[PDB]
Amino acid sequence: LVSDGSSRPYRCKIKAPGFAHLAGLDKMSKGHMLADVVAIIGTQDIVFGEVDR
Amino acid sequence: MELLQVLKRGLQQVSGHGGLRGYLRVLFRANDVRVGTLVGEDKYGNKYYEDNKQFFGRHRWVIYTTEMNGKNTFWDVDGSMVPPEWHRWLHCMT
Amino acid sequence: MFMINILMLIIPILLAVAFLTLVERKVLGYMQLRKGPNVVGPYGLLQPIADAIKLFIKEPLRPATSSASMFILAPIMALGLALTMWIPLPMPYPLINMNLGVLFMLAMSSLAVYSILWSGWASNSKYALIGALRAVAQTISYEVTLAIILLSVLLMSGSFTLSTLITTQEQMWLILPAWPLAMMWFISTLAETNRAPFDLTEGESELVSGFNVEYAAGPFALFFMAEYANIIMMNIFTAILFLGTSHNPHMPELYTINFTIKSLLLTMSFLWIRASYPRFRYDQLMHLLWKNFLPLTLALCMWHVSLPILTSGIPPQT
Amino acid sequence: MMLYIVFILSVIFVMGFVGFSSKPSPIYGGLGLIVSGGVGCGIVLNFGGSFLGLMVFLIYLGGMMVVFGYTTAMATEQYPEIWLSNKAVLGAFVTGLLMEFFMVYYVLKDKEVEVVFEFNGLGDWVIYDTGDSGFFSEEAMGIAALYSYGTWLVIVTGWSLLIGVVVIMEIT
Amino acid sequence: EYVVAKLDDLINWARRSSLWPMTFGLACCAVEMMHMAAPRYDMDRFGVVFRASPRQSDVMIVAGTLTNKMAPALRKVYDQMPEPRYVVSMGSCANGGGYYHYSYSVVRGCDRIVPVDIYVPGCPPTAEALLYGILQLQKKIKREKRLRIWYR
Amino acid sequence: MNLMLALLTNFTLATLLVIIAFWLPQLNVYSEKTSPYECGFDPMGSARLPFSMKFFLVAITFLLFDLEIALLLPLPWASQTANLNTMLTMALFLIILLAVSLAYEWTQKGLE
Amino acid sequence: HPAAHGVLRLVMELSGEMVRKCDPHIGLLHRGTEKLIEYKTYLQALPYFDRLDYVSMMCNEQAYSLAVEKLLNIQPPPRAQWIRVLFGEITRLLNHIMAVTTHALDIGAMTPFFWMFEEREKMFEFYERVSGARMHAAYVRPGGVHQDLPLGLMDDIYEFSKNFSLRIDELEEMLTNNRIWRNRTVDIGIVTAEDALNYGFSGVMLRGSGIQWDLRKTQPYDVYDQVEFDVPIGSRGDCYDRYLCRVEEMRQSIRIISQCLNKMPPGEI
Amino acid sequence: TYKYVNLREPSMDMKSVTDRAAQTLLWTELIRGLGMTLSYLFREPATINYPFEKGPLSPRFRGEHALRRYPSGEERCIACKLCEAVCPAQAITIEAEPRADGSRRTTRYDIDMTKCIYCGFCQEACPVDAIVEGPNFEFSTETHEELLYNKEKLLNNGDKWEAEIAANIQADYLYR
Ligand code: SF4
Ligand code: SF4
Ligand code: SF4
């Protein structure tokens, strides 16, 4: 949170997972089937609108 | 052993509730057929039974009857009908 | 009036397969803690007359990209081999008496999967294309688990007909003696007819919706009424091939009464599962058949062969 | 339901073939078989042989063909077609169909024409049975189970299959 | 003469009494849809069975926020549905867009993309004014298919 | 003579019921636009179906285990004989000729 | 259907069976946020932090309201914080009731959903009684909690907590050692590397993978220091040892909610 | 501190390994739970039978709007233009203009009911204590031409129940 010294802010930059836990799908899953990749995601707990990051 | 035990509440839930007439009629409105203990006064046609304080959240219930205000008869029941008092009662806000 | 004994069968059954769909979600309702279709009935028992009528009013699209000649002969089946298979099935008196007829089921158990391969191919691309291909592949590998473990017991009863199979289970409920097999007679029909724990054919999880995806309300009642015309039959079979009733040459009627109070318990098993278990990820799905289910089924066959011969037991038939 | 219910099957059978004996875009090839196989297992179920008929459904028509149909998605043709639509397929058809018809027309359309087609009478199934009999499982192929006398017939077939897989474990 | 208008106490009572709603999860509003099919307020078994495939549905439901890149997807899905179709938006973001209504990458309103029928108003509508919004749509079939064939 | 009366009865309800469902509203006066919007949720999909092998073998692999369990079928009729030893000694061969044919291939199923 | 209450489109080039490639397209929900929070004041722009995720509510804003009190050199009064542990550590009972279930609705089961959300309701009251609304509730602020809580809730928190460790014992006999599930997950998607750090992952898919670190006890928040808890850890880096944190991490919380009802001192808010 | 999970080794002795070979091959586990922990159906269902019974709430609940008035009515709103200026979503719209006597009041007051994000920022900025989020979820009409409200929709909607509202604040106002 930058702030410029007065009332309204300046960049407010939010980071939540979903730039990591899903940066690492492509890596993680190579070499297992397709019917795994549905059950890989569920463990990171990816929930979107958060990737509004 | 359990065939006549619980059964003695239901046969008194039927034969002592409206006989055959006042039973099938309160079942056809919904399957809520359990007869609460007490009653309530208000207001037009719509009672409030209230259970014995033996449940939480299904302990406080209501009954709709007929043609409140320029209304279709019965099988239309929505739930915006309750008088703007019971929102302080039926909703368990207080 | 032999033609009015038939049409008294086809009609009165289409009510069960209809009113199963209701007891579908009541029984599976109270597993969840809730009530089942309620508002419309009054009890709900009136739901399925309203549901049969919404589909055939609702417009039946065809894909612009389809081959219409196959998009008919295929479903014009999913309702035959489901309603033909019922024919020689004693309760107690079957409509037909087929000499070797037990074998005749496998004839009609084998010829339905050749109505899946048509439809999913008849239409179009990869959700019903390779998606109706690889439900072929599992459906034929659960026969070899089957015909053997059907053929086992038939060493223990003497022939291929069904009038003998009431005689031998007299006072012995044929489930004692082979109880190891009986298990595998169950997981088969549940794996073959595409039901809960091995669910893949009809899609929910692994894909969008398997094999049903294209048919709009118009044809899709048939399949949704076909797929439930197998499930209440294999399960109206198992209980003539295992849990036997006691024929009565006098009050035939008390045979069926006690007979539907079994086959109708038994069925309520594919509903009592579906609330419970998850799915198999198609590798594990066949990969558990050859390795695991099969070696036994051969081994037991080397056993029920000798057990009669080694006890002077040999059952009285040709 | 006359006495001709056999002759009416075969001439559907004989017409079962010529569908796929020309050139139909072989996803309809199957539908030239399972009719032919079906009516074929139809004819055999007369004459008293039964078990041996009801197997063709199980071992071949039911079981085999599906493999013939489980491929032709691997060899998959490009954009299939309704046969007899074309001018390439349709031309070859009829002349077959008429060739038995024009045969079947005056084969016997009259007293006799002439000799080679005249020594086959019709209509009572003159031969189709003999007398009466007793019963063994039926009489005929009711006893098709010989693990008695037949042995050197099995043990070749028993052994010839076991090699069926080894060959095919390789080239695959 | 009168048989028609008595017939529409069947067909106009059939289509209203069995609905096969699609849903769109997108944004916050999806969770207060789930709790309509959780056992408290029990959506199904009050006549409406929950999600099916795109082809078999009747009433699609829009939750959530509709950005640019989702519009080309919706429009297409709304089509394929059979005839007797409706569109019931919900949430303060299918009505003119919650907030984000001034953003750059949010379509403003989701009426603009399709002919929407019933509305519901607020971040999450309280899982109640949902069902209250349907017992509008089961009462919004008073219509008659008589008096098109049978007048003009 | 009453079997075929019990078959063509069955289809003719089914081959009826296609038209009274598929066809009847199919000529109804609703819109039914010809737009190429159909073939759901894989919009275009232009390819041949490629050969994928472990799809294939599970065809062949069965077809052969299938045969002999037609050969194996007439045991329960053959349990009634004169000399029976030529049965038990012989009957048990087919099975082990089946089970062997597993064990070999069992080194490689691949992903089946 | 497998969107997990969201809308992603991923594209894979699989090799005949195995995937070996994936490259998802996110950006379906963007909505244009951080361009719109330069245009709003500090207390006016709070909710757009609550509406970010759908599940954790008071745990967001605990991370904004702590990034403002700093620049102001100001701390809440003592009864402030000991709320923000009771709600702050009650919503860890939400995302761990969801990510064991609405994950395992993909695996296909039914009941472990229709069995739980009977209960995840009994919690949503406690957002409604305390302040207003069903889910998103704007309560925490730059100054500590908004307004005091009614006379009550401490016989509805206690009464509810001592019932709860049973429910979490109906997601155990129904899952852990049930085989068809054990086999759907073991040794699946294993990242054990020091890439599982190099990418800068956060908590679980860390702490369940070995490398041992957490930001609750290595840094204080708001009095978090004065209560005792143990951070479950995993054996091998697969999934089924990232599940097993999220059970033994719902059985730690009921320690703190039980430890934090005894200490709340009277004071302003 | 720490803990270590899934760190264990099998015992490897023939008193044990039967106990793990009486498990794989006899299914002695996997019938333990879902032979049982499933049934365990014999508990009373939990359902709020909806059209009639309804569930709990609290006096601080949020929902449909109102504008009160004192005893004999003043339209309690003074149009001080605040509940407008703290509004995150910017739903509110207010236009004052001096009423005939010279006391000021409103003319147009419009809460859009789609944009309103249900803060509880417009209940808490009004110093004269007019505008109040009601506790009734009555909603869901069939046309978006509607939910936009005018002034003279609100007042009624806030004089339809004031027996609901006027008895909540006097539970809640002692805290804040
Ligand atoms: S408020 Fe806007 S974002 Fe939050 S749920 Fe309702 S619509 Fe989705
Ligand atoms: S209520 Fe308070 S804020 Fe809303 S207008 Fe009247 S005075 Fe201004
Ligand atoms: S209710 Fe919430 S949104 Fe609507 S005005 Fe008051 S504060 Fe702004």
Residue C14 neighbours by CB distance under 10 Å: 16
Cβ contact G–D (≥3 pairs, < 8 Å): no
Q: In H96-105, which positions are buried (b, 16+ CB within 10 angstroms) versus exposed (e)? A: beeeeeeeeb
Nearest CA to ligand 2 atom 8: H80
Strand partners, E88: E61, E118
CB contact, 8 Å: C63 with chain F?
yes
Peptide bond between residue C92 and the one before it cis (omega within 30 degrees of 0): yes
H78 lines ligand 2 (CB under 6 A): yes
Q: What distance separates the 2 farthest-apart alpha carbons in chain A? A: 55
Instruction: Measure the CA–CA gap between A49 and G27, rounded to whole angstroms.
Output: 9
Residues E65 and G29: beta-carbon distance below 8 Å = yes
Ligand nearest to the CA of H88: 3
Q: Ligand 2 centre from B82 Cα, in Å?
A: 30
Between helix D7-17 and helix D87-107 the angle, nearest 10°, is 150
- Residue C115, C-beta contacts closer than 8 angstroms, at least 6 positions apart: C74, C75, C77, C78, C81
Residues C95 and C9: beta-carbon distance below 8 Å = yes
Between helix D63-70 and helix F53-71 the angle, nearest 10°, is 170
Q: How many residues does chain C have?
A: 318
Cβ contact G–E (≥3 pairs, < 8 Å): yes
Print the SS3 string covering chain H: CCCCCCCCCCCCCCCHHHHHHCCCCCCCCCCCCCCCCCCCCCCCCCCCCCCCCCCCCCCCCCCCEEECCCCCCCCCCCCCCCCCCCCCCCCCCEEECCCCCCCCCEEEECCCCCCCCCCCCCCCCCCCCCEEECCCCCCCCCCCCCCCCCHHHHHHHHHCCCCCHHHCHHHHCCCC
- Residue A7, C-beta contacts closer than 8 angstroms, at least 6 positions apart: G41, G42
Nearest to E28 by CA among E98, E103, E114: E98
Residues H44 and H92: beta-carbon distance below 8 Å = no
What is the secondary structure of B1-45 as a DSSP string? Answer: --SSTTHHHHHHHHTTSSTTHHHHHHHTT-S-----S-----SSS
Q: What is the nearest CA distance from D111 to chain F, expressed in angstroms?
A: 31
Q: Which residue of C33, C47, C58 is in closest CB contact with E83?
A: C58
Cβ contact H–F (≥3 pairs, < 8 Å): no
Strands H65-67 and H131-133: antiparallel
- Residue C9 CA, chain-centre distance (Å), reads 18
Q: Chain G contacts of C276, Cβ < 8 Å?
A: 109-111
What fold does the segment set E1-152 form as a domain? Rossmann fold (3.40.50)
CB contact, 8 Å: C133 with chain F?
yes
Q: Chain E contacts of H55, Cβ < 8 Å?
A: 40
Q: Which residue of E46, E56, E84 is in closest CB contact with C39?
A: E46
SS3 state of residue F79: coil
- Residue F71, C-beta contacts closer than 8 angstroms, at least 6 positions apart: D154, D157, D158, F94
How many CA within 13 A on the CB side of residue E144?
A: 12
Nearest to F23 by CA among E17, E59, E56, C76: C76
Residues H143 and E127: beta-carbon distance below 8 Å = no
Instruction: Measure the CA–CA gap between D153 and D169, rounded to whole angstroms.
Output: 26
Encoded tokens for D76: 């998959």
Residues G54 and G217: beta-carbon distance below 8 Å = no
Residue E38 neighbours by CB distance under 10 Å: 23
CA dihedral C166, C168, C174, C177 (to 10 degrees): -170
Interfacial residues of C (vs D; Cβ cutoff 8 Å)? 67, 69, 99-100, 103-104, 106-107, 110-111, 113-114, 117, 121, 133, 136-137, 140, 318
Q: Ligand 1 centre from G17 Cα, in Å?
A: 39
Q: Residue A36 is inside which H or E element, if any?
A: helix A34-44
Instruction: Measure the CA–CA gap between C98 and C101, rounded to whole angstroms.
Output: 5
Instruction: Measure the CA–CA gap between H129 and H165, rounded to whole angstroms.
Output: 13
Encoded tokens for C263: 């086959």
Instruction: Measure the CA–CA gap between D25 and C70, rounded to whole angstroms.
Output: 14
**How much of chain D is in helix, strand and coil states, percent to nearest 5?**
50, 0, 50
Nearest to B83 by CA among H138, E120, H142: H138
Q: Ligand 2 centre from H106 Cα, in Å?
A: 10
Pocket test for ligand 1, best of E65, E95, E126 (most atoms within 8 A of CB): E65
Helices within F1-112 (DSSP H only) = 8-17, 53-71, 85-105
Instruction: Measure the CA–CA gap between E46 and E57, rounded to whole angstroms.
Output: 17
Residue type at position D117? F
Chain breaks in chain A (C to N over 2.5 A) after: none
The burial class, CB within 10 Å (0-12 / 13-18 / 19+), for C156 is: middle
Between helix C294-304 and helix F85-105 the angle, nearest 10°, is 170
Residues G75 and G101: beta-carbon distance below 8 Å = no
Do C279 and G181 lie within an 8 Å CB cutoff?
A: no
Nearest to H117 by CA among E67, G134, G32, A16: G134
CB contact, 8 Å: A49 with chain E?
yes
Strand partners, E67: E106
How was this structure determined? It was done by cryo-EM
Give the domain ranges of chain D: 4-169
Q: Which long-range contacts (CB under 8 A, 24 or more apart) does D21-24 make?
A: D21/D96, D22/D89, D22/D92, D22/D93, D22/D96, D23/D83, D23/D88, D23/D89, D23/D92, D24/D83, D24/D84, D24/D89
Pocket test for ligand 2, best of H77, H95, H119, H121 (most atoms within 8 A of CB): H77
Instruction: Measure the CA–CA gap between F30 and F14, rounded to whole angstroms.
Output: 26
Residues framing ligand 3 (Cβ under 6 A): H 87-89, 91-92, 116-119, 121-122
Q: What is the nearest CA distance from C129 to chain G, expressed in angstroms?
A: 15
Pocket test for ligand 3, best of H118, H126, H131 (most atoms within 8 A of CB): H118
Do F41 and E83 lie within an 8 Å CB cutoff?
A: no
Nearest to G28 by CA among G10, G51, G45, G13: G10
Strand partners, H67: H131
Instruction: Measure the CA–CA gap between D63 and C106, rounded to whole angstroms.
Output: 10
CATH annotation of D4-169: 1.20.120.1200
Encoded tokens for E41: 């307020």
Strand partners, E106: E67
- Cα separations in angstroms, G73 against A1, C222, C262: 15, 72, 76
Nearest CA to ligand 3 atom 8: H87
How many CA within 13 A on the CB side of residue C108?
A: 19
Q: What range defines the domain where residue H153 resides?
A: 64-175
Do A52 and G33 lie within an 8 Å CB cutoff?
A: yes
- Cα separations in angstroms, D104 against D6, D39, D101, D111, D116: 15, 19, 5, 14, 13
What's phi and psi for B69, nearest 5 deg?
A: -130, 105
Instruction: Measure the CA–CA gap between G27 and G226, rounded to whole angstroms.
Output: 42
Residue type at position G99? A
How many CA within 13 A on the CB side of residue A36?
A: 25
Instruction: Measure the CA–CA gap between C289 and C271, rounded to whole angstroms.
Output: 23
Strand partners, D136: D138
Residues A13 and G2: beta-carbon distance below 8 Å = no
Q: Residue D63 is inside which H or E element, if any?
A: helix D63-70
- Cα separations in angstroms, G262 against C99, G153, G227: 81, 14, 11
Strands H106-109 and H94-96: antiparallel
Strands H65-67 and E86-89: unpaired
Residue H50 neighbours by CB distance under 10 Å: 18
Ramachandran region of residue G264, left (φ > 0), alpha (ψ -120 to 50) or beta? beta
Strand partners, H94: H109
Strand partners, G9: G25
User: What is chain C's alpha carbon radius of gyration, rounded to the nearest angstrom?
Assistant: 21
Give chain G's count of helices (H) and strands (E): 11, 0
Instruction: Measure the CA–CA gap between F68 and B25, rounded to whole angstroms.
Output: 66
Residues G106 and C204: beta-carbon distance below 8 Å = no
DSSP state of G22: -
Nearest CA in chain B to H168: B88
- Cα separations in angstroms, G220 against G211, G216, G226: 20, 6, 10
Residue C30 neighbours by CB distance under 10 Å: 15
Residue G160 neighbours by CB distance under 10 Å: 16
Helices within chain E (DSSP H only) = 3-7, 11-17, 31-37, 71-80, 131-134
DSSP state of E118: B
Encoded tokens for H52: 């009639």
What's phi and psi for G92, nearest 5 deg?
A: -65, -15
Nearest CA in chain D to C318: D137
Instruction: Measure the CA–CA gap between C127 and C134, rounded to whole angstroms.
Output: 11
**Any idea what the Cα angle at residue G164 is, between residues G161 and G166, rounded to 5°?**
145
Residues D168 and F104: beta-carbon distance below 8 Å = no
CB contact, 8 Å: E65 with chain G?
yes
Instruction: Measure the CA–CA gap between G149 and G126, rounded to whole angstroms.
Output: 10
Residue F5 neighbours by CB distance under 10 Å: 12
CATH annotation of G10-269: 1.10.645.10
Resolution (A): 4.6
Instruction: Measure the CA–CA gap between D44 and D52, rounded to whole angstroms.
Output: 8
Q: Which residue of C64, C155, C314 is in closest CB contact with F34?
A: C64
How many CA within 13 A on the CB side of residue E60?
A: 24
H83 lines ligand 2 (CB under 6 A): yes
- Cα separations in angstroms, G95 against C44, G75, G98: 37, 28, 5
SS3 state of residue E52: coil
Instruction: Measure the CA–CA gap between A32 and G190, rounded to whole angstroms.
Output: 11
Chain breaks in chain D (C to N over 2.5 A) after: none
**Any idea what the Cα angle at residue G240 is, between residues G237 and G246, rounded to 5°?**
100
Place of tokens 């179906």: F49
Ramachandran region of residue C159, left (φ > 0), alpha (ψ -120 to 50) or beta? beta
The alpha carbon dihedral of H74, H76, H82, H87 has a sign of: negative
Residue type at position G36? L
Instruction: Measure the CA–CA gap between D147 and F78, rounded to whole angstroms.
Output: 7
Q: What is the nearest CA distance from E114 to chain A, expressed in angstroms?
A: 23
Do B88 and H167 lie within an 8 Å CB cutoff?
A: yes
Contact partners of D by the rule of 3+ C-beta pairs under 8 A? C, F
Encoded tokens for E107: 């379509």
Give the domain ranges of chain E: 1-152
Residues E139 and E109: beta-carbon distance below 8 Å = no
Residue C257 neighbours by CB distance under 10 Å: 11
Place of tokens 């008096």: E147
End-to-end CA, chain F: 47
Q: Which atom of ligand 3 is nearest to the CA of H119?
A: 2
Q: How many residues does chain D have?
A: 172
Instruction: Measure the CA–CA gap between C77 and C226, rounded to whole angstroms.
Output: 9
Instruction: Measure the CA–CA gap between C87 and F10, rounded to whole angstroms.
Output: 10
Do G191 and A27 lie within an 8 Å CB cutoff?
A: yes
Nearest CA in chain E to B57: E40
Contact partners of G by the rule of 3+ C-beta pairs under 8 A? A, C, E, F, H
- Cα separations in angstroms, G240 against C277, C284, C286, E21, G113: 17, 17, 23, 35, 19
Q: Chain G contacts of C210, Cβ < 8 Å?
A: none
Q: Ligand 1 centre from H165 Cα, in Å?
A: 27
Ligand nearest to the CA of E98: 1
Strands E86-89 and E59-62: parallel
Do G2 and A38 lie within an 8 Å CB cutoff?
A: yes
Instruction: Measure the CA–CA gap between E141 and E8, rounded to whole angstroms.
Output: 11
How many CA within 13 A on the CB side of residue E62?
A: 32
Nearest CA in chain G to H36: G173
Q: Residue G95 is inside which H or E element, if any?
A: helix G92-98
Q: Chain F contacts of C305, Cβ < 8 Å?
A: 75, 88, 91-92
Give the domain ranges of chain G: 10-269
Domains and CATH numbers, chain F: 7-107 (1.20.58.1610)
